[PDB]
Amino acid sequence: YLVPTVIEQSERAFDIYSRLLKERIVFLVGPVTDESANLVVAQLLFLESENPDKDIFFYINSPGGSVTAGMSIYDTMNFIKPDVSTLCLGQAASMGAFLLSAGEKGKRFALPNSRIMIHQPLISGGLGGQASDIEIHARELLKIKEKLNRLMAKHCDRDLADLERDTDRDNFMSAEEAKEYGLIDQILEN
Amino acid sequence: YLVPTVIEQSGGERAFDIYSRLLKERIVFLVGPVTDESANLVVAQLLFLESENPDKDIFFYINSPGGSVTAGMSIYDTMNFIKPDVSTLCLGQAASMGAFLLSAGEKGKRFALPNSRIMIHQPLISGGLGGQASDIEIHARELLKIKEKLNRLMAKHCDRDLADLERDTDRDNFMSAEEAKEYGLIDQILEN
Amino acid sequence: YLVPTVIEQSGERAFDIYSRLLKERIVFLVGPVTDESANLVVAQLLFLESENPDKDIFFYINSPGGSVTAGMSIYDTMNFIKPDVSTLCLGQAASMGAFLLSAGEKGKRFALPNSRIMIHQPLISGGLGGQASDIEIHARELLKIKEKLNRLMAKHCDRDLADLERDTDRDNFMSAEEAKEYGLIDQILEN
Amino acid sequence: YLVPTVIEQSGERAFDIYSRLLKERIVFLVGPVTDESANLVVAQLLFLESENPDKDIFFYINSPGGSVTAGMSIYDTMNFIKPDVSTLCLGQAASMGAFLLSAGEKGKRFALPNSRIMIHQPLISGGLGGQASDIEIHARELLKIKEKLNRLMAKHCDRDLADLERDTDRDNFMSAEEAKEYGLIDQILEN
Amino acid sequence: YLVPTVIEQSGERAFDIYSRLLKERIVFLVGPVTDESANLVVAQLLFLESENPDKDIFFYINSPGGSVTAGMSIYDTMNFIKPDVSTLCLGQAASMGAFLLSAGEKGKRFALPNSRIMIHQPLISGGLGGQASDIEIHARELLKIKEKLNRLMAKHCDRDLADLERDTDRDNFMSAEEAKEYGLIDQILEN
Amino acid sequence: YLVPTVIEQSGERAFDIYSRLLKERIVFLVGPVTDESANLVVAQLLFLESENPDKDIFFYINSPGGSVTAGMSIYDTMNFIKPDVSTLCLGQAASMGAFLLSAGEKGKRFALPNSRIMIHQPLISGGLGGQASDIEIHARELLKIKEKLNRLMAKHCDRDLADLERDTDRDNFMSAEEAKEYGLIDQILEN
Amino acid sequence: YLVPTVIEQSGERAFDIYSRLLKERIVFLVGPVTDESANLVVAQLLFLESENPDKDIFFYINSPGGSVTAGMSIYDTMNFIKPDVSTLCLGQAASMGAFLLSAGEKGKRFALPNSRIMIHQPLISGGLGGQASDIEIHARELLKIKEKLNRLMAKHCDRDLADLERDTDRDNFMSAEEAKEYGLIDQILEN
Amino acid sequence: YLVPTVIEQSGERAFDIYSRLLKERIVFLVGPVTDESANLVVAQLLFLESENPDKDIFFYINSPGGSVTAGMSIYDTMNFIKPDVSTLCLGQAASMGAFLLSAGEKGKRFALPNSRIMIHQPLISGGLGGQASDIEIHARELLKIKEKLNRLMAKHCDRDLADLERDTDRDNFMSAEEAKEYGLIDQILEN
Amino acid sequence: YLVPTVIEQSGRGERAFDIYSRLLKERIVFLVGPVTDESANLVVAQLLFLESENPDKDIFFYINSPGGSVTAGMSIYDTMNFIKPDVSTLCLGQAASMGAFLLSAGEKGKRFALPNSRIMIHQPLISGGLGGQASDIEIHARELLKIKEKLNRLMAKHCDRDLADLERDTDRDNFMSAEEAKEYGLIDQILEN
Amino acid sequence: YLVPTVIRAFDIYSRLLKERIVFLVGPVTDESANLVVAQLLFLESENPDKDIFFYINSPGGSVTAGMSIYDTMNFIKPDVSTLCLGQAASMGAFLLSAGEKGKRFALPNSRIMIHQPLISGGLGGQASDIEIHARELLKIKEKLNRLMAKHCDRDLADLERDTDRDNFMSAEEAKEYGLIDQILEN
């Protein structure tokens, strides 16, 4: 894709995403990979240094992705001093919904027709080799499953038992249902 | 493709690619399929243009066969959220989510060119339906909710009953610019 | 594979070993249940009823599952024909294989001691493409099949429909003893 | 697949199990309807009429559908030959399989209790490429086939053409009971 | 496919069902017309003339078309051999299949009521690559074949060459009634 | 390909050679007409109108055709914008390329002496799969496009709609002189 | 393909239809000429000479061509064996197929009325890779084969070598009448 | 492969060499253990018990392993049938092949002097995709199979379960002497 | 490939060019490799640009091409004949098929070849596939024959030969040395130093 | 690959072109040969009298592409010195021997291979087409051997023997043969 170039008056020419980063807007678009997550981490670290007090706006339009990649974003969001506000555009599914709920409490938003989906993790990696190797990877996946449900329950002010029920299979929610659930705080209109 | 470079005269000169030059005139293009990446560029441009001037109209030129519903909804909610009116224009074709975003323009400012083709239809797969019957039931229910949401928003855009959109989006409904104007998808047809 | 040839004493008649066992009223369902493998079972069940409508038919099952419609052709043939169809689980009876195993005549459903029996809700009976109206239709048909299978399984096992709905939600693996306690089989053979 | 061999008592004659069932006037249509599978059905129907023009022919159907022209060769052969062709649905009779099922002699169209019968308008009878003039021709031919199928189905089911046009618009799945109420089959076999 | 075996009473002789029908002077052309499928038809036509030069040969056609040269080997064999070759359209007779259908003995060309008959100008008889001189040669040969086919079709149908040139320009689909009115077939069979 | 860089004297400004020609109001349509290549033409036409609404725009066409909707975005932009869009055929203008060539301002449609101009009815504007109801819809839409193109072509050429319907039935290749006599272009350039 | 079985009256003997025609001294060359298909022809020609060295052998040709060396094994066998080898063109005799057709006994080379006979210089008898020294060798060998084929063709046709060199330069398609006038065949069969 | 034919003196009867050895109560398990290869072993074991329930059956194993469920069908058949099943390792008995080797009748488990016997924990009995709940289920089932195999192996070898858990952790290759000392086989044959 | 950057010397300053843009400044246009819509349109764009810079000075068209599309080559051909400045053509390595056509299309007296260049002329191959129905194949065969005659006629005009000579000589691939092409009439001179 | 930048900022190959060094690396194609021709033409204009240094590390390539370089080398006024780095095989060895006599160099462990040409193009189609392409390949084979014999001051019969199959030579053997004039050490 051709990323448009915009001019900032101060003149400085930016691509439109660097221009929005100047306004403390970080985009997570598409699958969460090592490379896309590290760009988010790099932007979060950079924005904290520019101003540790001003809010960072984390715009999420993602179907999910790697858990470890999403956890690098998650720990960076919680570590850095400035509040990270999260906004759901289009969809926040799987780790995208996790990072959406991971925003600062009171500053988690979704657009009115966005779709938010939460579910237990799939394969974090293949389970081949010997039964001893498969047992190890199964145990690690169960630990990740419990860790995700526990952190989700903390984000949503719900019991761990509620998240274990609701993440068993793909749980699709409107913006209103996610607000009632505890994934987001407000729904934006204008 | 090689995107041509054009020179803007100012108070000096600035070299733009022709799409950045048109963005300076508040023209946003949605060309080809609606994807996460192409929709987020539209959202980024809509957000940028609101800050440049919240009062001036934004011109959203659509030549798209459709695409992802969630991607199109990111554009749709951005269009409705931002303060400036988003005028929409159909070039060549506005099909599926392209027709949805066309009808989503500000009422009175939805346009189409005389030989454009506008097609509305119920959504297809928003994603595969594999796995167990319990998983397939969930994805079928989610697709039906999306189908109802799209028909409901389309009926609101067109000032028609939900029952009308449910009939007309059952199978691919192709419309000329005149038929789309009579239907309620667009307001005017441009000639000169 | 080369199927061995055996000689039946009567004069002599040369059989492949599977036709020789069919002479003893033994029908094998081995591997996936397809239109072709299910119709061979149906053809053998129909043939054996004509040979002797009173003698038991022995249906040996070693199958991971397969098509529901193909398995239903076997299922209805088993219930229709006059002779009792005894079922035996060798190696495994999974999905429609477990359904056909439980479909044997009550009191004559067997499993070998180290066999594995797995029951679960059906997967795709066919793709769900096309328009949302087509996907709704195929989703409704799959749900009807899911309910029909759970209802027939509950009848076979003398259990409530609610029990089968819980237990077939995800792949439910059972030993021969667990399947006997569940109600899928009646006896476990040893010698 | 290995087709079992069975012995007919008469001296003795060794048959594969399908030739043995053909001796009992049982013709199988299993799997997709192709030129080759349909011509085998036609060859068997013609052969059975010569053997005995008065005795019923039993046409066992377990088919997801197939070619319309191939199914029409079976259909016209069924109507042409003197002996009644009874039809039985095993597992499934979908698309042209449901058409041939309903095409059986009125009063002798059967289905097994858990069989699935699906009727729908035809899909591509062939690709629609080339120029718009070629595409117009193939679209017109497909519409003529669509009307011909709905008209013959309405005749089989004693229903109005308007009913079949509604009900074949999208995949219409029916249980054996629903197909009996619809008019596709006459009876449901149990024992 | 498994071709069924049938027993002819005479002692007994076991035939596959197609060899049994060849004994009744029935030759099948099923599927595409290839060098191998056409030569089998030629071999059967030559064999049947030797068995009885006076009795009619019944040529059952269910074919979408195929090679022109392959179809011409059948065509010239049909016209050469002394016995009349009656032709019957089952399912479909398209392209060279419709040509061979119309090539039957006048008065003995039949079609089943729901058969589909399609006539059209030939497509590529072979690729047109190489140099412009090679392409000119292959284009001229294709035009000669096109004229030869239209001329022979016009002779079969008792129509003017100009009529066949119009009607074979694009795929011309015909019902059995339209083909009878056109002149491709003489009668439509019902019972 | 490496696009050469040229220097414009004014100070100096470095352009790629296509941006340099756009400065002279020359827009190129080279290769197939796609959504992306058509939108670049539209973007250039819109940009050039704003630079000068009164000066002619020179639209150089070397295209085998492409998407109808993509070509219609160019077509409506050409007719909408105030400045005359002169069209020139280089190498070839086929299908939508010939349509856009004839779409130039009357009196300003040009072709080079050895250019090739081809007009024809549209092919597939999209696949025709799915159910017969879907195929009927896409066939009707293609026929509407076919009539719209022939009607607009007849308007461009000052000919009757019946003439364009004959001449676009199959690929109609024309020299620059034949296209001038037909009405697709107004003049042929030499020097 | 399923090759039909026919019964020869003598007791009875069951043949496949090609072995039955070989009993009548009919040898078929159908499809491309390969090492395996040519050696079968050679084996049949050698066998038929042993059965009766005086009776004619009928060589039916329906072939697009093939290997030159494979065709030469047939050619030398035809000329070596004592009985005359009559040749008949069915459908087509192209390339080495036309060579073997013209290679029949003078006065006994036939073609059916709508057969197509094509003569041309050979293509690659094998790839020409490796070094320029290897390519020179293979080019020289191909030229020797080209001259040998034209020389033998000119002998068969009672024409000058210069005539065959002109006429085999590019694909030369001939009707049965043109091949008779050329000298490739002696008679055209009708009835 | 071409399986040789041998003649048994009795009159004479022609066998393939494997059916001839089955007459001597020799059953071969060669190559991977699949549903089809295991069911042939089961069919042969069942057949041999019927022929003589008292005489030993000789089970020759040359297998790298295979499916656990397939191997369990053989295993339960070996233990169920009345006659002792002696096992012999030729070349190799690995994974389920070593399990079935150790499964022979105690005192009658043999290996050739240079055979290789390998025991190890099972690998994937099936993929572990889907959701974490599905992966947990398949992991639990694999662990149950792992424990069942080690428990049965420990019983065969007269060793503690803890010994087999250590030794099957990774691929444990053993000579015939090491397998005899371990308890997998009883004797090593030389002459 | 990495295209080298060269520095053009001007008044107290330096303009950096890639080496092909630097040669275009000297009115040198390259046609290298197959003739496609994109490569031919670049040649046309350069020919149009060079006419505007100076419609009197010769344009040097360096050709190293095995051939390509006829319509693409015709866009170059008509541009060469239209624009006012003479287009001199030079054969480097090879000028085959449409490459030889464009070589012979240079201004008479200014068509050159290097001493070991190879020039090949032949009738066109497929200008496009010939599928579909026999009516479609007849149309495409007729169009190919018209192109074949047009190419031979223009070649005969370039070479001052009879149309019958070009019809013989383009029947199959006719390879020529620079000397044979000069004697034939495809080029005027052979450069050495 | 990332081409380093050296100090105006040049990539390292444009910097060496400023020193009149032209590289032919890898197979000889239409595009790689035309870059060499463009550089040779450019350098003649920058200075028609100064030597051009043509560094060759090539396994061979197209004959017509190599001939465009060859004729450009002989045409332009400045001497083109050639240096073999790593290897000069097939047309690479031809262009190496094509350097100005007395200025053809090779590095001590370079490998130089001469051989008759392979396919200059496929030989499909009809026997008449194959005869034409075989004749053209033989003319190219004779032209290459004749030009090689001229470069090496040897008889045409010597090159016809020695190029029959792949003839690998050390730098010393190529110097004795006549392909190069000197071997560089320091």
Residue numbers in the entry:
A (entry chain H): 6 to 15, 19 to 198
B (entry chain I): 6 to 16, 18 to 198
C (entry chain P), D (entry chain Q), E (entry chain R), F (entry chain J), G (entry chain S), H (entry chain O): 6 to 15, 18 to 198
I (entry chain K): 6 to 198
J (entry chain M): 6 to 12, 20 to 198
Publication passage describing the model:
The ClpXP holoenzyme is composed of a hexameric AAA+ (ATPases Associated with diverse cellular Activities) unfoldase (ClpX) and a tetradecameric serine protease consisting of two heptameric rings (ClpP). Together, the ClpXP complex acts to unfold and degrade protein substrates (Baker and Sauer, 2012). ClpX uses energy released by ATP hydrolysis to create a pulling force that unravels folded protein domains for translocation into the degradation chamber of ClpP. Here, we present cryo-EM structures of the ClpXP holoenzyme from the gram-negative pathogen Neisseria meningitidis engaged with a protein substrate.
Further local refinement and classification in cryoSPARC improved the density for ClpX and revealed two distinct conformations, at 3.3 Å and 2.9 Å resolution, hereafter referred to as Conformations A and B, respectively. However, these two seam positions are not equivalent: in Conformation A the seam is further from the apical surface of ClpP in what we designate as the ‘upper seam’ (US) position (F - dark blue), while in Conformation B, the seam is closer to ClpP in the ‘lower seam’ (LS) position (F - yellow). In Conformation B, the X6 pore-1 loop is disengaged (LS orientation), while the X1 pore-1 loop engages a new section of substrate and the X5 protomer is now located closest to the ClpP surface. Interestingly, the X1 and X5 protomers make additional contacts with the substrate in Conformation B. Whereas all of the pore-2 loops from the other five protomers are radially removed and disengaged from the substrate, the X1 protomer extends its pore-2 loop residues Ile198 and Thr199 to engage the substrate at a position three or four residues down the substrate chain from where its pore-1 loop binds. In Conformation B, only the RKH loop of X5 directly engages substrate, with its His230 residue interacting at a position three or four residues up the substrate chain from where its pore-1 loop binds. In Conformation B, only the X6 protomer is ADP-bound. The X1, X2, X3, X4, and X5 protomers are ATP-bound with clear density for the γ-phosphate and the magnesium cofactor. In Conformation B, both the sensor-II arginine and the arginine finger contact the β and γ-phosphates in only four of the five ATP-bound protomers (X1, X2, X3, and X4). In the X5 protomer (at the bottom of the spiral), the adjacent X6 protomer and its arginine finger have pivoted away from the nucleotide into the LS position, allowing the sensor-II arginine to move closer to the γ-phosphate of the bound nucleotide.
